[PDB]
Design a binder for these strands. Structure first.
Lengths: 200, 85, 138, 195
RNA sequence: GAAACUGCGAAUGGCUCAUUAAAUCAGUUAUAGUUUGUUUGAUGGUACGUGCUACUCGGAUAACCGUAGUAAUUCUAGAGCU
RNA sequence: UGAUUCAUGAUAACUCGACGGAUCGCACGGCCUUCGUGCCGGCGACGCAUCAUUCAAAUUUCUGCCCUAUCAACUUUCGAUGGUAGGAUAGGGGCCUACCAUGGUGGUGACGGGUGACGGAGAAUUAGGGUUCGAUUCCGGAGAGGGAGCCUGAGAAACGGCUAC
């Protein structure tokens, strides 16, 4: 959430509650848009970037798995990688493709599934690319102890009632498997964004 | 839409005279107890739907949950097993 | 550092400094060695200091949060140099402003303040006539 | 007993006294909203029509329309209801309180009368004195009703708070306010922006 | 700018743990049994008249000013406004 | 979509009919056909409808809780138990209520009683294993003198609201 993230930059001493003056003068923008809400839902891959004489940031994970800043390029800031959190499916071409922060993006790609990821720009919300969820792809584990690790998909296991586990080969250690909700694919052979050491 | 499963075998099905379609099904279980380390056994009987019908007493079937039709009916007769001869 | 007399310098040192273009100012730590000496002063700081960073006014700049440790000869506080007088006030909390001289602390009475608002709600009309009404009525 | 009497034509009020049992009993056992002949009430009140508007008894409890009874009854009140003002402390608050009947009795401390039609003879405190309007119509269409300017003329020049007046704040006497619903390019641009 | 009207909050917080012993509740599911102001982002040729006559703006209360009633009440009557 | 046939869409309809900003606020702009407050239209403010959504909730499934049989059968008065139907409410739902059947549950301790018996994360103290404790700046619920009933509102069976006793 925004308040924690902004404060990480500021923290030398005696700001914090005075975050409010910065927000209301609109010298913080998040994804090119005004939000002054501390309770704002955030996830991995949010872009922060502020007006004019500013900087660009990507949300990353520490050892716990809490949000922290890393500097990111201005070119990369224009783009954002967004999980398709939920889907309204098919006919007449009216998907609501939910994201973690709550952005909707509309209308067919020649695919679309839940747990697949959509590459989006930032301001206009038009579809740069669509990334399929499949084996061999690069993943970040969003939750648990295992957070801040990256690895390549060994296999996905499909079962009755839910598809229980999806297995990741790599880790600092050895293989681990996680739920589909924990898995956020962040790279594919078609389009990766992954060129980052990570977390723990 | 369907539920989480438990397997059970029928303790009942033929209890006093004339019965409305349903059976009582026992689960016995053991669990590790602190101190003694020896498991303590705890009975439980639950009243199952036989929407499928074709249910005789002392018959093992496999139960999948559905929404509670009156109260204590959690499971339903998904599928069976059947026996020999 | 810190201009001498006979009574030793009492070091003017800065440390952990980021210029942050959101708050629009300079935040840094003032770790003042006081070898063989007492308290530097709130004045003596902002009188040197000023001329290094070339803000060249005591008026806009504040130093605070001295605490210390046992054993003496050092104290740790925090101080900031601001880009403008007008800009500074908005970002700053009120507690800095009042001691600096930029603001006055208003003292209030809880009982007077809250009760008075309720009274305003209750009367509708001029209600001068009610005072005369009560006299007649007894 | 006491009467606080209104003549709405001037918009003035003052209280006047009627003492004599024969005069007073004309009011008695009548309901709220009923009209009353003036001459019975007093000689000075000749030609007048008085409508019983309400009043309060001793202990100050006010009449409420339609409730009936010569006595008092305890009834639920709500916000934005007669016999209730200054609002509840919270929204949606209801209060049970004693409230008086609409039926006139001797227990009344004051009866409120509103003059429906003016009589033959003047009443010194009420009719003889006169009060000008506190404010006049703010809205543009309402101004056209009273002042009969017509739609082309534009309201602002002619008007001000109850016609065109010049008045002092502190030490300056000299303008019109901004009348709204009045058609302006400000409304036109956003209205155009609908299409 | 005071106030008044409208809007929203006051359901939150804080406190206590009497009752309450499969109950609260915990882990864990289900919601294909549902709702959700706010947040986030999409989303409106429609509106009517034989689709050329047919529809483009109505008033009425508080602040107020004045007049009143009760021993008193988050008390309230009444007029002239708007 | 694992599983909705709902959705999307077709067709005939319902409706004392929901919405589409008259003061659509505020600060600015082009271009001229009668060079005309002509005719256009940007930006975001607050508000508007429907949808996904988020911040959320509430029911519900599995499993788990101290002590006692000097508590062995419990329940069906007036749903106990299940079926069928309906009305209700956001919704399934004995939820209640009609009709219908006669069940449900128990030695694996049910049913009953007691308990500073809130539950939990946790705490104390124990090598360990355990034992004991959990009023407590957190987490979830309950109550706010005792009880019932209800308005408003997204949401309260509110109590520094009401209404009644």
């Amino acid at each position: 959430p925004l308040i924690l993230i902004i404060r990480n930059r500021l923290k030398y001493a005696l700001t914090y509650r005075e975050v409010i003056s910065i927000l209301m003068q609109r010298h913080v923008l998040v994804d090119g848009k005004v939000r002054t809400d501390k309770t704002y839902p955030a996830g991995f891959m949010d872009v922060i970037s502020i007006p004019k004489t500013g900087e660009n940031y990507r949300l990353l994970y520490d050892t716990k798995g809490r949000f922290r800043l890393q500097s990111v390029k201005d070119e990369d800031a224009k783009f954002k990688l967004c999980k398709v959190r939920s889907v309204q499916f098919g006919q007449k071409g009216i998907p609501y493709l939910n994201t973690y922060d709550g952005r909707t993006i509309r209308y067919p790609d020649p695919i679309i599934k839940a747990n697949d990821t959509i590459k989006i720009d930032l301001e206009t919300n038009k579809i740069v690319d669509f990334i399929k969820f499949d084996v061999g792809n690069v993943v970040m584990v969003t939750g648990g102890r295992n957070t801040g690790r990256v690895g390549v998909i060994k296999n996905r296991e499909k079962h009755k009632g839910s598809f229980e586990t999806i297995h990741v080969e790599d880790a600092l250690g050895h293989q681990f498997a996680t739920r589909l909700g924990n898995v956020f694919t962040i790279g594919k052979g078609n389009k990766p964004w992954v060129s980052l050491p990570k977390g723990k | 839409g369907l539920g989480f499963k438990t397997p059970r075998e029928a303790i009942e099905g033929t209890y006093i005279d004339k019965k409305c379609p349903f059976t009582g099904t026992v689960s016995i279980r053991g669990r590790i107890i602190a101190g003694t380390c020896h498991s303590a056994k705890m009975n439980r009987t639950i009243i199952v739907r036989r929407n499928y019908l074709h249910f005789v007493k002392k018959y093992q079937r496999y139960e999948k949950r559905h929404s509670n039709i009156p109260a204590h009916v959690s499971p339903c007769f998904r599928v069976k097993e059947g026996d020999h001869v | 550092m810190a201009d001498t007399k006979t009574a030793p310098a009492v070091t003017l040192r800065t440390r952990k400094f980021m210029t942050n273009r959101l708050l629009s100012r300079k935040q840094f730590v003032l770790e003042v060695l006081h070898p063989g000496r007492a308290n530097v002063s709130k004045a003596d700081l902002k009188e040197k200091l000023a001329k290094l960073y070339e803000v060249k006014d005591s008026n806009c700049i504040f130093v605070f949060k001295f605490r210390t440790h046992f054993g003496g000869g050092k104290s740790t506080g925090f101080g900031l140099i601001y880009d403008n007088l007008d800009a500074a006030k908005k970002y700053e909390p009120k507690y800095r402003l009042i001691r600096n001289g930029l603001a006055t602390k208003v003292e209030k009475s809880r009982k007077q303040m809250k009760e008075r608002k309720n009274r305003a709600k209750k009367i509708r009309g001029v209600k001068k006539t009610k005072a005369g009404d009560a006299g007649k009525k007894k | 007993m006491k009467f606080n009497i209104a003549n709405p034509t001037t918009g003035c009020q003052k209280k006047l006294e009627i003492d004599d049992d024969q005069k007073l009993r004309a009011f008695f056992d009548k309901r709220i909203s009923q009209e009353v002949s003036g001459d019975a009430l007093g000689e000075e009140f000749k030609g007048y029509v008085f409508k019983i508007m309400g009043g309060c008894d001793k202990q100050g409890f006010p009449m409420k329309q339609g409730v009936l009874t010569a006595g008092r009854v305890r009834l639920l009140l709500h916000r934005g209801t007669p016999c209730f003002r200054g609002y509840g402390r919270r929204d949606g608050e209801r209060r049970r309180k004693s409230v008086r009947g609409c039926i006139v009795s001797q227990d009344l401390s004051v009866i409120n009368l509103v003059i429906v039609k003016k009589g033959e003879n003047d009443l010194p405190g009420l009719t003889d004195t006169e009060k000008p309007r506190m404010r006049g119509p703010k809205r543009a269409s309402k101004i056209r009703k009273l002042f009969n300017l017509s739609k082309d003329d534009d309201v602002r020049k002619y008007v001000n708070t109850y016609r065109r007046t010049f008045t002092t704040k502190n030490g300056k006497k000299v303008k019109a306010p901004k009348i709204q619903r009045l058609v302006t390019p400000l409304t036109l641009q956003r209205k155009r922006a609908r299409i």
